[PDB]
Design a protein around this ligand. Structure first.
Ligand code: MN
Ligand code: MN
Ligand code: MN
Ligand code: MN
Ligand code: MN
Ligand code: MN
Ligand code: MN
Ligand code: MN
Ligand code: MN
Ligand code: MN
Ligand code: MN
Ligand code: MN
Lengths: 233, 233, 233, 233
């Protein structure tokens, strides 16, 4: 299986598998069962912004989600990512839909990682996406539309979101997030998203994640498993 | 008085005023009495590197000091800097010497701050310093030498450090580290230093600090007070 | 007098003083009489974007102005800026109005300069401006409005532009754009603007400029002189 | 065949194929026969630095090579790279040796490309290289040594350079250097190198190049052809 670290924007509460009884954002460390979660006042229909940051010294993975002119949602979890993730990784975005749906549009995405022992670094940012982006590995249904937006999950020609869909987008170049005796390593990511839906209770969510470089959509990882895990353990 | 936040590289143990009985690095929040300290295996004579980072979401000020081919020293303190510092600040470097001395040479210094509500930012970096640097506010004895290094404390023409000296260097432009309803704010700083000394027990240390924009060397802030505070409260 | 280098977005054709008989953008080197100009298809009422770049090796100052979904305007001039500008400078934005008016709103502004001999650098960017920005030197009428925009020239409470106005905004920290034996130096700047006007022929324009660090609005530098020069020589 | 743009640090004068009768750096546009060259006061044994920059507005490819405490070598060529290169490319470093040899060690390499229509970007930098770098495509003999240096051409266990060797290193992620109606696109690259040799006349050189994303070492592209072209046309 893969090794996964992620910040989930969980729109549908799957109380049966540990999820709180309300939309939320959480930090997942090798398990869909978030190590930490926080109430997310979902603004279906409005453009949101997610910011994720971490550094090997403070060892505190944090994330904040906001919408113009409205309070933000934040979540943090203390953990030394060097204990979880391998030295070389690929970073990406994933999203799913199940019985209930929603659009999982990504309008922009930037990422920066630095490894000091000087200081090697990788930084990329898309304010728009082109169809057939050669610097992205699109998995599942994920695709880029004519507007320059990244649709992680299927969206009809009418723009209507489809259920039971899954997709991911990984940056092409692997990233060296750590090495023995490195002095400090850090990474920061930001993405803007647009979740729309005709459903009274939209599902399932969007995530920013980091995994082994050969990561792929696990068998039956749809719906409540945000396309990151094979099961709910 | 000033409002000060700092990461101190305390070379001399002043046990009388809270200091541990060994060289150390610490985080000071409006008091020379560090809120958190860690043992610093001082490498007198070798070039060291300090890295300081913080973001408004994780709210954890961290710092790591290292030397080539040798373990590093780290220290962190959980605190919401928005509660301590004013919205506009100036960042700088300070250093002192008392009865016992040491050189407090700065070879390079970089700093980055971002404020998102987009994202305003300020970034500067010196790999060398020119004499009469117009983008630095030099306070006390602090000066730039012919080699392009910043000498925070007095150093004889022979290169010998002098005791009872104090100096600071602030970046010229004020920095807006926070604003109401900002989504996230962060800053990161790095500097390389060279502390040399003929003394068996060198003093007193070097700090990276953030304070009110009109900050200045407090009356009798020399020696064990690292040129940041008027007293030891 | 001051030493000035600038990229002018000249909205009003002052044919009497060398100006072409149409709105234009030009590169000015110590003279309002541009060394090079190009036809500017002014989009009064729409948000424009200006990008200015230069490096000591290619020695070619360039600038491009564009508006969404419409062709751009470009202008270049080969010149070694080390022959014109002093080693330390301040960069800024200026704008004016005369008999005829227009708003000269700046929505964002970023700047980056690098000097290698390593590589010292300065970078700042505002996606919004706060009233009473401590990292800007506002000259003349220039002010920040409640929306977070920079109004270089007077704008009535109703938003109506006023004639015979002048204003400039300089970044606070001086910039070291060059030093003897430097290997390469470069700078890049971008700003977005909004020029509105009830006039059939709006005036006078907006500029990005670089000058001596103590530069100020020259006596009677209003109107066609874009607040940069004392006369039209 | 491939589409190649490159800055060559040509250490051996192959006068028969257009080369000047002295070591030189040049800009090659789809031909080993440089469109522009300049005398290179080669400092065999000392660490050199190369800086390459270009932007779609000025349309002037430039490069400068220097060594500590000694004059630099510069070369420029006016050309709209959008006419030569395809929209998606891969950037890299290449080097060769023929009858005569030299080491072609790369100590660091950074690259930045921006495409505005906002502003997509890619930036990476290595201050050291790890063996088996997953974010580099190593071609030919190119390899990373235990010191963290990139050896483009074969170097014996004793550190002695070998003749008749060729190698290249490409960054893993493709780069989108241009798109229709883009406002401005730019790229900048820097690398430090170490060329050593026991030969009275070392060969053959090092280059930074940009080519089609599937570029590879052309058949018999060794020696004077710097591993970029199949012939000398
Ligand atoms: Mn970098
Ligand atoms: Mn951040
Ligand atoms: Mn319901
Ligand atoms: Mn910035
Ligand atoms: Mn950092
Ligand atoms: Mn002792
Ligand atoms: Mn920099
Ligand atoms: Mn640019
Ligand atoms: Mn008219
Ligand atoms: Mn970028
Ligand atoms: Mn450059
Ligand atoms: Mn010879």
């Amino acid at each position: 299986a893969d090794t996964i670290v992620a910040v989930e924007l969980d729109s549908y509460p799957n109380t049966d598998i540990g999820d709180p009884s309300y939309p939320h954002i959480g930090i997942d460390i090798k398990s869909i069962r978030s190590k930490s979660t926080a109430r997310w006042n979902m603004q279906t229909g409005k453009v949101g912004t997610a910011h994720i940051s971490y550094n090997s010294v403070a060892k505190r993975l944090s994330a904040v989600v906001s919408y113009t002119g409205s309070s933000s949602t934040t979540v943090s979890y203390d953990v030394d990512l060097n204990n979880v993730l391998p030295e070389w990784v690929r970073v990406g975005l994933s999203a799913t839909t199940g019985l209930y749906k929603e659009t999982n549009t990504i309008l922009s995405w930037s990422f920066t990682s630095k490894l000091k022992t000087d200081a090697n670094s990788l930084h990329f940012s898309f304010n728009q996406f082109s169809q057939n982006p050669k610097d992205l590995i699109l998995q599942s249904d994920a695709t880029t539309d004519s507007d320059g937006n990244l649709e992680l999950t299927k969206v009809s020609s009418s723009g209507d979101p489809q259920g039971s869909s899954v997709g991911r987008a990984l940056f092409y170049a692997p990233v060296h997030i750590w090495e023995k005796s490195a002095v400090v390593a850090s990474f920061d990511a930001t993405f803007t998203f647009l979740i729309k839906s005709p459903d009274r209770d939209p599902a399932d969510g969007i995530t920013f994640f980091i995994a082994n470089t050969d990561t792929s959509i696990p068998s039956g990882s749809g719906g409540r498993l945000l396309g990151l895990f094979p099961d709910a353990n």
